[PDB]
Design a protein around this nucleic acid. Structure first.
Ligand SMILES: [Mg+2]
Ligand SMILES: [Mg+2]
Ligand SMILES: [Mg+2]
Ligand SMILES: [Zn+2]
Lengths: 141, 349, 38
RNA sequence: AGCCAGGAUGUUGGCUUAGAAGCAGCCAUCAUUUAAAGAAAGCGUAAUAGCUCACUGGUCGAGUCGGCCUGCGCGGAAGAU
């Protein structure tokens, strides 16, 4: 398999093409076009939602023709509308940012269970909650 | 929106040209232009989302127009009123996106004589009332009274928040036309007063006697000393390298005493050379802020027979002189800032 | 070369070698780290 | 100590700021697969990348690794017939 050549997964939520610095100079230094994301990239964005932060591979050659494959949204932004919290920690021990029920996370883990490694589905719960503890998210018993 | 609408409309395309210059790879070898674009990403993505909200409101306005046969006036009336309200809210919130310290307010009499002193007293009372209805403190630093009524020259120090941000537009000359109190007949007279507003600054005086930048010479002295004076280095000379100030001392027979007092004189006469510079700088600034009160150079006119106050910088007239003279001059200073700030965002080229 | 009365190791590549009765430091990565005692 | 091999997984993290992604500075420092692997000790980007280390497997194969107390030496150490 061809390893990383000219693509790094970094861009704003998939909702629209949004020709902004996060997308323009994300490819402007590598080529292709900024406006193309409204047709090919946004073909599947009508399926999911408007405003899902997902990282997409931006493989670009010297031919200025690029192919893109996305993935699940990262767990940090994944449990935001599912947790109701728009902010994040940075002082998650002096205070806390909110509350979260324990049962609210595993039912979304199967979305990320395909691209995450682990013995089974329940193992993914521990990885998220340990990360979730860094955001000050208090588990609801 | 007199021209800020036009300013944005001309600049609204620049909000897309910044994006165009983002993805050209010709401005990425350097850094300055890309830094400018990144700082000026289209109306600052927070306010950009605010503009998306305003455009949603405008699109809601755009609909529900192409149908007739209904007494529908009230709903789009309130809709366009809400659109204007949110438009002005957008104006203020994107205009909000320094010098907010205490101030020295100086006002003195111009043309007129005693009547100028009376008007200076009235004007200072107006400013004092405006300050007291703001939770600001006013203290009379100095006073020179005007024989009959108010002051030949009153200078006061105002302490509070954002004082200079609001009072810095009061400099210049103010003209008053009215029937004076020191007049036997009923003749109307025109007089002027002169107002200056200043900030406050730290006034550190560092004694740069740091010997790392001094050149010191010891040598023989001249005069009547017999055999001792010839074979001794009892004269001192110190030069301060950064400023080029040179001082020498040979008055006493001891090198230590000469060095000590010469160094003291160097310190005193290097401090004076900075105090004089600061004094002339502040004097010059006061001079070009003040003007020369002669009823021809002025910023606002108070006509008492007509009860009118007019401002010549923005060409705005009002018929609320009595409310102004009782300390409600806020309505005068709000529009000026509205113009002034409208030029700060334009001067980015 | 920096000549000083206290030669010490500054990175992980620095080495202590005594040549001709003189203690000195040399490292293969940073040429600014070579020094001798004097 | 050498010599081969590995040296992994969601932080494009909120927390600051235009951009900060282990390695600029504010918090925390969990979990998974595993023989190992740090949510980063170092070099390196405007921002990514890229480059080492720990640690873990195979050959080699006999010793090896740092403090404490003490004797004698080394550098630090330049003046005028
Ligand atoms: Mg004598
Ligand atoms: Mg030699
Ligand atoms: Mg010795
Ligand atoms: Zn070194």
């Amino acid at each position: 398999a061809k390893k990383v050549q000219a693509y790094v997964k970094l861009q704003v939520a998939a909702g629209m093409a949004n020709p902004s610095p996060p997308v323009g100079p994300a490819l402007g230094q590598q080529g292709v076009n900024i406006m193309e994301f409204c047709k090919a990239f946004n073909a599947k964005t009508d399926s999911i939602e408007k405003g899902l932060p997902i990282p997409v591979v931006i493989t670009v050659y010297a031919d200025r023709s690029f192919t893109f494959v996305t993935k699940t949204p990262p767990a940090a932004v994944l449990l935001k509308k599912a947790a109701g919290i728009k902010s994040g920690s940075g002082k998650p021990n002096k205070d806390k940012v909110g509350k979260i029920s324990r049962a609210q996370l595993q039912e979304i883990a199967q979305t990320k269970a395909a691209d995450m490694t682990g013995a089974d589905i329940e193992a993914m719960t521990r990885s998220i909650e340990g990360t979730a503890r860094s955001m000050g998210l208090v588990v609801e018993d | 929106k007199p021209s800020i609408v036009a300013k944005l409309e001309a600049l609204h395309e620049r909000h897309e040209e910044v994006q165009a210059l983002l993805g050209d790879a010709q401005t990425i070898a350097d850094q300055e232009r890309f830094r400018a674009l990144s700082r000026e990403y289209a109306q600052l993505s927070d306010v950009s989302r605010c503009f998306t909200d305003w455009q949603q409101v405008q699109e809601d306005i755009e609909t529900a127009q192409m149908m007739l046969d209904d007494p529908e006036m009230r709903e789009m009336a309130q809709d366009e009123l809400r659109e204007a309200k949110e438009k002005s809210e957008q104006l203020e919130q994107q205009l909000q996106v320094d010098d907010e310290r205490n101030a020295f307010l100086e006002v003195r009499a111009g043309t007129g004589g005693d009547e100028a002193a009376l008007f200076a007293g009235d004007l200072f009372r107006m400013y004092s009332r405006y300050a007291e209805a703001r939770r600001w403190r006013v203290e009379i630093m100095s006073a020179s009274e005007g024989e009959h009524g108010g002051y030949k020259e009153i200078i006061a120090k105002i302490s509070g928040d954002g004082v200079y941000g609001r009072l810095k537009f009061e400099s210049g000359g103010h003209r008053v036309q009215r029937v004076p109190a020191t007049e036997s007949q009923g003749r109307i007279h025109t007089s002027a007063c002169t107002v200056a507003v200043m900030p406050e600054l730290p006034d550190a005086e560092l004694p740069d006697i740091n010997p790392a930048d001094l050149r010191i010479d010891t040598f023989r002295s001249s005069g009547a000393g017999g055999q001792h004076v010839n074979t001794t280095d009892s004269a001192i000379r110190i030069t301060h390298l950064p400023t080029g100030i040179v001082v020498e001392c040979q008055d006493e027979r001891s090198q230590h005493k000469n060095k000590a007092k010469a160094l003291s004189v160097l310190g005193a006469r290097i401090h004076a050379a900075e105090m004089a510079k600061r004094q002339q700088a502040e004097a010059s600034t006061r001079r070009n802020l003040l003007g020369s009160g002669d009823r021809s150079d002025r910023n606002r006119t108070y006509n008492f027979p007509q009860g009118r106050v007019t401002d010549h910088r923005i060409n705005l007239t009002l018929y609320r002189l009595d409310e102004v003279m009782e300390g409600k001059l806020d309505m005068l200073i709000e529009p000026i800032i509205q113009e002034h700030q409208a030029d700060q965002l334009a001067a980015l080229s | 070369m920096k000549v000083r009365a206290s030669v010490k190791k500054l990175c992980r590549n620095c080495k202590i070698v005594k040549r001709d009765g003189v203690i000195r430091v040399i490292c293969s990565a940073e040429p600014k780290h070579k020094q001798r005692q004097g």
